[PDB]
Amino acid sequence: GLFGAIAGFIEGGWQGMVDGWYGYHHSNEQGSGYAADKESTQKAIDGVTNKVNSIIDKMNTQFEAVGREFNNLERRIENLNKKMEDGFLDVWTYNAELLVLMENERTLDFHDSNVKNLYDKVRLQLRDNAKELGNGCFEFYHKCDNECMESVRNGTYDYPQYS
Amino acid sequence: GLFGAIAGFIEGGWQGMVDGWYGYHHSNEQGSGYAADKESTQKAIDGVTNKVNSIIDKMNTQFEAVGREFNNLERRIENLNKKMEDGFLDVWTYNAELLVLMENERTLDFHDSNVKNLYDKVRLQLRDNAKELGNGCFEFYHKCDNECMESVRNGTYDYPQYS
Amino acid sequence: GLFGAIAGFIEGGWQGMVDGWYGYHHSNEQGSGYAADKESTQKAIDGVTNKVNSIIDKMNTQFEAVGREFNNLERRIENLNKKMEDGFLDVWTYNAELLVLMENERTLDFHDSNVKNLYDKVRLQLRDNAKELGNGCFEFYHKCDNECMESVRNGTYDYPQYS
Amino acid sequence: DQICIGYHANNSTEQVDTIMEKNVTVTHAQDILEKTHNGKLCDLDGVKPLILRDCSVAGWLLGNPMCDEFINVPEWSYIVEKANPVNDLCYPGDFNDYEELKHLLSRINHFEKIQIIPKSSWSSHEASLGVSSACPYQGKSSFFRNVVWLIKKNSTYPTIKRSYNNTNQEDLLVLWGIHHPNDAAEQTKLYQNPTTYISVGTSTLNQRLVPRIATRSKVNGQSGRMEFFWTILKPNDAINFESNGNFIAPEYAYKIVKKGDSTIMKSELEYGNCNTKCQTPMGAINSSMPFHNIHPLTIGECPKYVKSNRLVLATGLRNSP
Amino acid sequence: DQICIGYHANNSTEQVDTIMEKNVTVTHAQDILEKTHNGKLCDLDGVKPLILRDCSVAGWLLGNPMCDEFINVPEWSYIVEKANPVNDLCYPGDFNDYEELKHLLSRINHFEKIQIIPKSSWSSHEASLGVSSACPYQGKSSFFRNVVWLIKKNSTYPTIKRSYNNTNQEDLLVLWGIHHPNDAAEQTKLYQNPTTYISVGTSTLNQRLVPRIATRSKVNGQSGRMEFFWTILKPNDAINFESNGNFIAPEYAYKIVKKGDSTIMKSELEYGNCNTKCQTPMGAINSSMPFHNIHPLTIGECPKYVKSNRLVLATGLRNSP
Amino acid sequence: DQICIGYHANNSTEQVDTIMEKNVTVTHAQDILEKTHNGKLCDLDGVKPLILRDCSVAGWLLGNPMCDEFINVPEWSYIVEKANPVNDLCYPGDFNDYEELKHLLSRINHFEKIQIIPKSSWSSHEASLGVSSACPYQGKSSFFRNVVWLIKKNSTYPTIKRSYNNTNQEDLLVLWGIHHPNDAAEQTKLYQNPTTYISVGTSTLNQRLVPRIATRSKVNGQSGRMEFFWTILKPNDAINFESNGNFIAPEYAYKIVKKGDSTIMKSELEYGNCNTKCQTPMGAINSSMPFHNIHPLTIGECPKYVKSNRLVLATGLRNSP
């Protein structure tokens, strides 16, 4: 993907994280667990919902075929009529299939972007107080309990305390 | 946004920077101030201008309706005619509205990209000679006067001198 | 470009790298040389090939003009016919030219993305065992022979050994 | 101790296509193409379609004796006609501006039949021996029930001068016809007068028909022809007929009570006794999808037709192996 | 000490839509849809439109006496005709291939009128009593000024054999007509000859009209009908008329001096006495926008029509709260 | 020691356009627009086109004596007709429903000519003096070879009653005509009978033509006119002719052996003696490109037509200066 996170430096997803699209997994003396990041997840849900409705609505007004009859010495206009009706179906078929293709690609890269921005968000908090392992994980120099882990998810990781 | 800078790790824009789209704000003993980055700004101006003209020109040749009259026993071809004219208006209306939607989204992400690339440009110069605060700001280990600040905007920040 | 690598922090390409699109250049006591990264290159080749075929196939079914004759008192339907045929040519001409424009832009940014992801991949391996110079190059604190260089291209750079 | 950033995966096998890659497995998707139908012709919004079965529109409107089902039809949502209905023009001929009339029916939801010229009222002409073997009913020779085939009484066909004033506050579909005999001997046998005509006038109509004689192939066992014409008579306007031969008089004329959205659907299918809000010639549709790929010609509140076999939007993200 | 990277914000409230988000406030934008007009019908590039007012194209060209304004009209940029003009065919009838002729006017910017048959020149026929109450002028009964309604002189209607050679180096629009009387008594009263015809010939035209008699409803106080026909007579070609009754002769024929881009605009609106370079039936347009949403049928140098209410491009970036 | 990440550059000058930037130099590209042709009219898939040269479709089918090349033509891939072919209707006239017939030829790949009425078989009428100076062959006056211009024998034109049964298991294109004389004196001179007719009947056809007399301009040295009519006679159906004057009888009728994809191409060009699989009026196409910009009207296995001058896809990346 364009942003290098999904199937990239983060090699795979988490079957164990069910309550969100993006989130954190911690492991310390007390235990381990998955916690979904609500903000980034809800933002993704909104973006995709609008996109689907935006797509639906743009296609909502489009060509409609109508039945028209012609006799045996009106073959030219019968044929003109057929080509007209068929021609618009090809145009609208093309529009639909292309839009899906183009926007599907953008949707997957959108998800990739959201993961990367969340990863960088954490990276920018921790700074040189943890080791950037290279796999999506940050390994702490200090012992980091469940409140410490929560401060990272909070956005409230107190860098000066653990420095 | 896709690149995580605008409304991201840089929480908001600067009312105080009026002479450009992207730039720097410095603060030291001598004072503080905004300086627009000309290169990245002019590059953005060019990209958006071309885009607007590119959009205008692609739509410049498009279907034009013409008035055609039919008598009371030519209702089929009158109706064929109406559907033909209306059908093309829906196609061209759809094209215009979709292109604006798609390219508007790309334009905002373009701006987000330009800010991020400018931020990384500075980051790559400063290296470990300043603290990456996490908010778009770099806090220097050494005292950095207005010439020192200018060298960063220059692209000429002499890392080996302050290391 | 959107991802800041091509013509960005990596100022220019390599005439000397002929066996791939993206890769590495090393320089040490034993010598220097170009080595193409096969994985990222083959992935780019696949993405572009599919894209070209996807584009070809979406256009493969499209309006076809047919010759139709009208006498001197059938000028209205002759004109309707002309506008219908011409109208579809403008629609399909517009589709083709726009798709090329939009997908060309995405193709160049795709290449920019692949270089950046490859650069970050290496960055994440080396960590604080090398200097990030700012130009696409990493300068090692330890002496790095051709096997050491190969481990970086491998993905197998043993950080704990050189730390 | 460590904290990691990561993303959702699941047991989904749904795939989507993109420009650069096809069959990409994702965690969530949304199909937007309706691919199914019940396979039946059905009532639209409760309102039943007019199913002509093996009768055509001409046969119904002219009152072909095989189309006795369709005397005084109730209002319809849409009309269903086969591709090649057998019960069309029992007596060979042409229907003048048939397609234009058929198009007029796309704006019509209900006809009410009324009598303008009584069959008895032809006191100076013979009206009850205007039949043929080509239109049989219950074994006996019959004819289009809505029009009267007039012939001479006691070897004289006197000139006809009839007028009808449209006193209803509706448009009125009037139908009449001319008979084209085989030879000059049959012309005289039927109507006596060697040269004949039919003049029809309204505020707009200024017509004068003459019979064209020719040796023709037998169609339905007859080489004679009937050419049927029509008009819409506006309210407070009179139609005037004058003829000295070969005239097919109107007994009944259809009254256009309701004008609405309708359509003449072309289908071999019969009647499912089902209800729908979106109908196709292939069957009915019941979905919330924005698209379908069943058939272009639909009636009612329908999704948009596309030729695609598949339209699936990625909602989730790339799912892991 | 510190240096920061950041971006522009301002007091703008302009919003743009995207796929994933609507009403996004941006620092700069560009509206590309022209939404306004002056509401007036106007001169195009200085050149005035031919405003027929309440006259139709037929009335103008046949020279209906109420269309005296439009005798010898100057050249026009475009033509403006109402939806239901009252001054159409004063005497009831049909205009043959009226729509095809109207289409021909879309390629025409100027007619010059000329006399081909003088009204005096009918020395063997009566020419000055060819009037009706249906076309009144200044209280008296009049007629279409461009054509002569010919009648018998002293109870004899001799055969007419008239030819005109097109010596001008232009195409020529010729108009003529046939009269359809009410009954055989009126036929004889007007033209005497019971059976009549009109034969018209050119290099291409091979026509022979006969009057059709029928009882018709009174339109404009008359149950008689006039059926008008036309042709384009090419240079150096002759048109030939032969008739023994019911003939409406051409006095004047319009000469086609200029052929250019024109259009018959349909509008109830009158005349603003304004100038423009892009005209619609709703009004005129003066903008540099690439698009508008006023009306599909335009004439001149215009932006493209779309059905949108709104088209705004983001030029700047996401503006901050 | 150091390791760098970088990308390919080369000596390419190929450029591509994007939305934001034009003329971007890339390392690799792919042109998808076919811009060239051989400039010749050519055999399609081996099968030669029917090149009418200066003859029209009417001239060929009526058997104009200048179109002797096109007697018993072999099967064709497509047909090539000039814009204004000189050898059209040698004798002035009209071809009834010519465009509809031309459209029928788009579904036809081969005609086989057959004789239905022998020229000798007119024992009661004169058949060999039906010629004119307007259709000359080898210096002498001739006529359309496929039809017989019948005249009176010893000052009597007796009624014609001719029937043909279509015993072939094919549709049959039948052609006939009517002659329109200059005056009543020529009518009697040619056919004697003052009032004449032609009645043509089939299972569907019910026609009766009458000659229309008019003073007409000389076209090809003649002011008389011929009006040609046609029908498709289905197998096992009979066509019946009856006429007492002015009849152009069918000698030959074309038999429709093969129905396939064909087209009437409009081109001034002649014959290159080349072979192709995609043909245009401008020339032939031989490429694997998905698009071309030569001419919209093509026949065969062709890329799609677009109006573009240039369509180039970037495959490689931005190339360095």
Ligand SMILES: CC(=O)N[C@@H]1[C@@H](O[C@@H]2O[C@@H](C)[C@@H](O)[C@@H](O)[C@@H]2O)[C@H](O[C@H]2O[C@H](CO)[C@H](O)[C@H](O[C@]3(C(=O)O)C[C@H](O)[C@@H](NC(C)=O)[C@H]([C@H](O)[C@H](O)CO)O3)[C@H]2O)[C@@H](COS(=O)(=O)O)O[C@H]1O
């Ligand atoms: C061998 C022979 O001569 N038999 C005649 C009948 O005529 C022949 O036999 C027919 C069965 C058929 O093979 C014909 O081709 C053939 O001429 C003769 O009358 C019949 O044929 C005539 C043809 O001129 C008619 O078709 C007639 O049919 C009707 C019909 O049913 O449509 C009879 C009907 O009553 C008529 N109706 C009206 C209102 O006139 C119509 C109508 O005249 C015609 O359709 C208008 O074009 O024709 C057949 O009955 C038969 C009886 O004579 S009859 O008095 O003319 O009816 O007598 C045999 O000896």
Ligand SMILES: CC(=O)N[C@@H]1[C@@H](O[C@@H]2O[C@@H](C)[C@@H](O)[C@@H](O)[C@@H]2O)[C@H](O[C@H]2O[C@H](CO)[C@H](O)[C@H](O[C@]3(C(=O)O)C[C@H](O)[C@@H](NC(C)=O)[C@H]([C@H](O)[C@H](O)CO)O3)[C@H]2O)[C@@H](COS(=O)(=O)O)O[C@H]1O
């Ligand atoms: C009560 C009565 O009998 N009155 C007659 C008039 O005819 C009747 O009354 C009329 C007012 C009207 O209601 C008619 O329906 C009715 O028959 C009679 O003539 C008038 O009516 C006739 C009907 O045939 C004509 O329509 C005529 O109108 C004109 C016209 O203005 O259009 C008169 C005009 O001079 C004629 N012009 C030419 C060139 O012929 C035309 C033309 O003949 C006609 O339009 C072609 O179809 O008709 C009414 O004036 C009235 C005068 O007699 S008249 O000499 O026949 O004109 O005499 C009353 O007693």
Ligand SMILES: CC(=O)N[C@@H]1[C@@H](O[C@@H]2O[C@@H](C)[C@@H](O)[C@@H](O)[C@@H]2O)[C@H](O[C@H]2O[C@H](CO)[C@H](O)[C@H](O[C@]3(C(=O)O)C[C@H](O)[C@@H](NC(C)=O)[C@H]([C@H](O)[C@H](O)CO)O3)[C@H]2O)[C@@H](COS(=O)(=O)O)O[C@H]1O
């Ligand atoms: C000066 C003079 O009077 N010369 C006459 C010839 O007539 C002159 O030439 C004509 C072209 C025309 O300009 C006349 O006004 C002029 O007087 C006369 O015959 C010719 O004129 C007639 C016109 O009525 C015909 O056009 C005829 O041509 C043919 C033809 O070639 O098409 C001759 C041909 O044999 C005829 N064929 C048939 C099957 O009838 C046709 C046909 O009749 C016509 O096309 C149907 O509309 O006409 C000219 O030859 C000439 C011989 O007289 S003729 O026997 O009537 O032909 O005699 C000169 O003295």
Ligand SMILES: *[C@@H]1O[C@H](CO)[C@@H](O)[C@H](O)[C@H]1NC(C)=O
């Ligand atoms: C993708 O899947 C379909 C059926 O699920 C398969 O038939 C098709 O060949 C596949 N396409 C590619 C490019 O692998």
Ligand SMILES: *[C@@H]1O[C@H](CO)[C@@H](O)[C@H](O)[C@H]1NC(C)=O
């Ligand atoms: C009948 O029609 C005439 C028009 O011919 C109209 O004026 C009249 O009012 C109608 N009604 C009656 C009851 O006569």
Ligand SMILES: *[C@@H]1O[C@H](CO)[C@@H](O)[C@H](O)[C@H]1NC(C)=O
């Ligand atoms: C956006 O703004 C318009 C106009 O101000 C408003 O009417 C509309 O409801 C808004 N739509 C959304 C989705 O916010």
Ligand SMILES: *[C@@H]1O[C@H](CO)[C@@H](O)[C@H](O)[C@H]1NC(C)=O
């Ligand atoms: C008149 O028209 C004839 C043809 O009808 C043409 O040949 C002639 O040159 C024209 N002009 C004159 C002055 O006769």
Ligand SMILES: *[C@@H]1O[C@H](CO)[C@@H](O)[C@H](O)[C@H]1NC(C)=O
């Ligand atoms: C791009 O290149 C073409 C072809 O060389 C040239 O004609 C054109 O003017 C250029 N346009 C721009 C915007 O650089």
Ligand SMILES: *[C@@H]1O[C@H](CO)[C@@H](O)[C@H](O)[C@H]1NC(C)=O
């Ligand atoms: C001829 O045509 C008639 C119909 O007119 C048909 O019934 C007959 O079988 C045909 N064939 C022969 C050999 O008569």
Ligand SMILES: *[C@H]1O[C@H](CO)[C@@H](O)[C@H](O)[C@H]1NC(C)=O
């Ligand atoms: C987040 O969590 C810590 C405990 O780990 C708590 O002290 C702090 O108040 C919380 N802040 C927010 C914004 O939730």
Ligand SMILES: *[C@H]1O[C@H](CO)[C@@H](O)[C@H](O)[C@H]1NC(C)=O
């Ligand atoms: C930028 O600024 C410094 C002083 O702050 C100056 O010495 C140097 O030459 C400048 N370099 C450029 C490229 O402008």
Ligand SMILES: *[C@H]1O[C@H](CO)[C@@H](O)[C@H](O)[C@H]1NC(C)=O
């Ligand atoms: C990569 O290279 C090293 C030598 O530098 C070698 O020992 C090792 O086996 C290689 N590993 C892989 C995965 O190719």
